[PDB]
């Protein structure tokens, strides 16, 4: 008989939670408080080195009246803060130029192309959500023209189209959407398609093993679990379209779950999927005043 | 009673007298992956006495003009002891940590020192300063091993994010007038049940002096900062030959 | 078929509309969600976490940016000298922009509830001192001296073994919510002014530094709420992302 093999005898796997969530439909009320001339109990003095926030309340610092607070906390939930469609993509199908000149385009999916949505989502390290994507197609002037477009979602490993005549556009198995530009915007819902339990906007590591030389530094921070495929758009036809086209892609999250809040970005964004910043133009978080003693 | 503490794990023991409370990052203790969360079928390895113990990495010098330093976990231990050997022989690793930063000074020294755990601490370069270069940090800067790396722009945390909000993550302060050590227990924070200890750094330890160190000539000028850390609930799976990178 | 009539608002794309959309992947099941630490259910949980308040937002050189996280306290002439002052409205430009509370207020139009600023003394152990931290509600100007500031809400902080004090800025407003205060007519929504004065002197023995620094950490109380989510005028990127 071995005592220590019996003492544990179990992997608890409980993740003992020191705290639990309580229902907080509204901000807490204020209770009546009077003067307290006491010793030993000093609610105002804290120890910020403990790493906890102060547990002091109004009732212990001033003499408060009873306020029945009925202010809802519903709008600060995640499904109220993220369920708002914002611009995540913009594709061009011009008639002349060097960008997508052949009447088709591929757009690898990523939220980090525009500052607003990117900064909203960077607030958390991990997020798990179902997307709702809306496609708004027009001309560069905003004119609505009678053109038929095909949007194909090509998941990783599937053949990307190389021409608007490409056989990949047969979409035998890939999801696709045919929309006339005169129709309303095209709206679809996408599930959570990551191989991991949540998308992560910050991946501190490399995707592959081996020596990490400078020539492969761009692989740093690249999370394949975030690469959900590409969005390919073509003008449905064997001849070049006669209208210059622009497609704006908006996305709103729903059924959102977020983990590990982070400090919010306070520098200009430079590139996609990296925190790169201008070292010679670092700026304070907010405005600066002349003196600490004057406003 | 709340300032004196003893952290005993494995064959190691840390005694502290000028200490604050203990922080359990996000309110959860490290634990073993459950059968419902796990996905890999091979039986994990749980040494539990030869890897779950305190290791002392190395010591920094806190001078009056220090920017601050950071370490990457679990990268700091990928070459130290039986834990390093396990992390090199196995493809999949999982564990929480108990970090203990130590910095003692006289009652006539002053200075504050934020100690923070930042999960998924990605490092951003200066982009050539002007913001035109699509530069990426070198390998030594992303994974500096057990020597850490001295921060270049602590205000933006070398990642474009403000240090002032870094207290939103599990943290403590070493205030030389109050305490001389900080203790943070971090569970396993990842979107996967296991992962590689060589490719992916689960989090980063940051030690940044918010209030500069100060003292008068005649006092001890050398103030060391020592990082100690204990893996907890360590699990390894996917046995193969040893690899370092 | 079934007779129907289309009403105004058809074909419009409201970005905040919450409706059903066509799924692209039939019979698709996501990867199961494992337990991950630190889940967030409400943004208010972040507003109740102390973050450093840049009261000393004077310097702007790229090398002296970290000096914004603390402000100095020194031996004075024992005449109730003024140490620092800032505005108490978290959605306004200034110190509060350094806090998670300020950044989140940037995303909401109206707020309510009591604030709390914790000041931590990071001086020598031998250094003693008393401060007066005063909150002045709206209407009253910036106090010219300690006697005028003492007339508002205030706490008297004594440096000791407990190296932190909490000033609770109570919710004293004519309205239930406050829009973010601003210069102009919206200064109607100003919260007041937080000032710090010397109650006594800053006293040290021989061999201890004559100057220490205070670190301010702001947060929201439990009666805090926000509403009318909007887009932040806090960062305003000035380029495109490559």
């Amino acid at each position: 008989r071995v005592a220590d093999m019996i003492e544990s005898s179990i992997g608890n796997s409980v993740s003992r939670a020191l705290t639990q969530a309580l229902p907080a439909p509204t901000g807490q009320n204020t209770q009546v408080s009077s003067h307290r001339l006491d010793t030993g109990e000093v609610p105002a003095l804290q120890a910020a080195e403990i790493g906890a926030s102060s547990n002091t309340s109004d009732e212990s610092m001033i003499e408060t009246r009873c306020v029945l607070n009925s202010h809802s906390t519903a709008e600060t939930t995640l499904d109220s803060f993220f369920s708002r469609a914002g611009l995540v993509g913009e594709i061009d199908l011009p008639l002349e130029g060097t960008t997508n000149p052949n009447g088709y385009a591929n757009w690898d999916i990523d939220i980090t192309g525009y500052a607003q949505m990117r900064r909203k989502v960077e607030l958390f390290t991990y997020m798990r959500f179902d997307a709702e994507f809306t496609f708004v197609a027009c001309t560069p002037t905003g004119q609505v023209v009678p053109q038929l477009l095909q949007y194909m979602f090509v998941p990783p490993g599937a053949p990307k189209p190389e021409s608007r005549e490409s056989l990949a556009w047969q979409t035998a198995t890939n999801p696709s959407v045919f929309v006339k530009l005169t129709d309303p915007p095209a709206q679809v819902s996408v599930p959570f398609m990551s191989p991991a339990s949540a998308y992560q906007w910050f991946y501190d590591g490399y995707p592959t093993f081996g020596e990490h030389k400078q020539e492969k530094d761009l692989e740093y921070g690249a999370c394949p679990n975030n690469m959900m495929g590409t969005f390919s758009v073509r003008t449905v036809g064997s001849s070049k379209s006669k209208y210059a086209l622009v497609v704006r892609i908006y996305m709103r999250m729903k059924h959102v779950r977020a983990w590990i809040p982070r400090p919010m970005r306070n520098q200009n964004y430079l590139f996609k999927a990296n925190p790169n910043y201008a070292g010679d133009s670092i700026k304070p978080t907010g405005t600066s005043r002349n003196a600490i003693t004057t406003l | 009673s709340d300032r004196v503490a003893q952290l005993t794990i494995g064959n190691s023991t840390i005694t502290t007298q000028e200490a604050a409370n203990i922080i359990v990052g996000y309110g959860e203790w490290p634990s073993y992956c459950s059968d419902d969360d796990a996905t890999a079928v091979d039986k994990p390895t749980r040494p539990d006495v030869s890897v779950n113990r305190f290791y002392t990495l190395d010591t920094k010098l806190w001078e009056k003009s220090s920017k601050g330093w950071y370490w990457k976990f679990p990268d700091v231990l990928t070459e130290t002891g039986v834990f390093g050997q396990n992390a090199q022989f196995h493809y999949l690793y999982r564990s929480g940590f108990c970090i203990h930063v130590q910095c003692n000074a006289s009652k006539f020294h002053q200075g504050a020192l934020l100690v923070a755990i930042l999960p998924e601490y990605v490092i951003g370069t200066v982009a050539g300063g002007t913001g035109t270069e699509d530069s990426h940090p070198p390998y030594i800067q992303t994974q500096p091993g057990a020597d850490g790396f001295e921060l270049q722009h602590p205000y933006v945390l070398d990642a474009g994010i403000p240090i002032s909000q870094l207290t939103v993550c599990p943290h403590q302060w070493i205030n030389l007038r109050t305490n001389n050590c900080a203790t943070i227990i971090v569970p396993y924070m990842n979107t996967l049940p296991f992962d590689s200890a060589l490719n992916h750094c689960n989090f980063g330890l940051l030690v940044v002096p918010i209030s500069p160190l100060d003292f008068d000539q005649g006092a001890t000028p050398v103030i060391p900062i020592t990082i100690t850390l204990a893996p907890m609930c360590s699990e390894f799976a996917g046995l193969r030959q040893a690899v370092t990178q | 078929g079934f007779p129907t009539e289309l009403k105004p608002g058809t074909n419009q794309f409201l970005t905040t509309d919450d409706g059903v959309s066509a799924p692209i992947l039939p019979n698709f099941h996501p990867t199961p969600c494992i337990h991950i630490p630190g889940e967030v259910r409400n943004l208010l949980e972040l507003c109740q976490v102390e973050t450093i308040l840049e009261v000393n937002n004077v310097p702007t050189n790229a090398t002296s940016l970290m000096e914004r996280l603390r402000f100095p306290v020194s031996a004075q002439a024992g005449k109730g000298e003024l140490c620092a002052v800032f505005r108490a409205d978290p959605g306004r430009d200034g110190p509060w922009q350094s806090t998670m509370l300020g950044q989140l207020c940037g995303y909401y139009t109206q707020w309510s509830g009591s604030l709390e600023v914790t000041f931590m003394f990071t001086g020598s152990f031998m250094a003693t001192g008393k401060m007066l931290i005063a909150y002045t509600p709206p209407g009253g100007p910036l106090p010219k001296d300690r006697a005028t500031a003492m007339l508002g809400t205030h706490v008297i902080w004594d440096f000791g073994l407990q190296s932190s004090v909490t000033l609770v800025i109570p919710w004293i407003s004519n309205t239930h919510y406050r829009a973010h205060a601003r210069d102009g007519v919206f200064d109607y929504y100003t919260t007041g002014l937080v000032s710090i004065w010397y109650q006594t002197n800053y006293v040290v023995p021989i061999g201890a530094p004559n100057t220490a620094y205070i670190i301010a950490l702001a947060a929201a109380q439990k009666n805090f709420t926000m509403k009318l989510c909007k887009d932040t005028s806090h960062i305003l990127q000035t380029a495109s992302i490559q």
Partner: antibody
Amino acid sequence: QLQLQESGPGLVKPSETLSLTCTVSGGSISSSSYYWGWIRQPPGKGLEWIGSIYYSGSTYYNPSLKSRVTISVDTSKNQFSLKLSSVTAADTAVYYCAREITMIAWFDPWGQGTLVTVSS
Amino acid sequence: DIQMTQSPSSLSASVGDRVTITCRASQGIRNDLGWYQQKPGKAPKLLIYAASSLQSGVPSRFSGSGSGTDFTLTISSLQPEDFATYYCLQDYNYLLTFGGGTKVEI
């Protein structure tokens, strides 16, 4: 309120013993929270602190002038005096006596000022 | 001796403008700096002590900022009566040194 008004000869030819005497009116020189300092300003140039005296006799001299100066305090008549030995041409200036609070860079109130030129 | 360098050595501004004069020491004193004003032919007047404290009676348009190496004195609205020479005085290690002195004239 406190007032300072110093006196001393206006002409001090070289190698003399330049001597001043600063009297305090409307207050007590025997205060434990104040030093008494001497400031020298060459004509048309900046200021230069010489030395401070404590009412108990303790002194703090300028390292450039630690040996050639003597600052003394008479608590009986509420006065303090500066005496310079081995005067030279680089010594002529306007001198002030001020009340000082140590470690705050404080000098207030000041005297009227007395200008002395080294000539024969 | 640690010597303070001031900038600029002279100025010329108008009434109602902001006049900024910097004084930075080689080493760190961290608050042991004061600002003194002097009219031509008169004794210096204590404007600021501890680099931030306004001396009672000094108008609020004078402001001292900074700590450590660099210190700044700002007049929010230069006045005709503010024509004078301004000095910074450091008192470190119980040895006091004045600055170069800047002659602000309108």
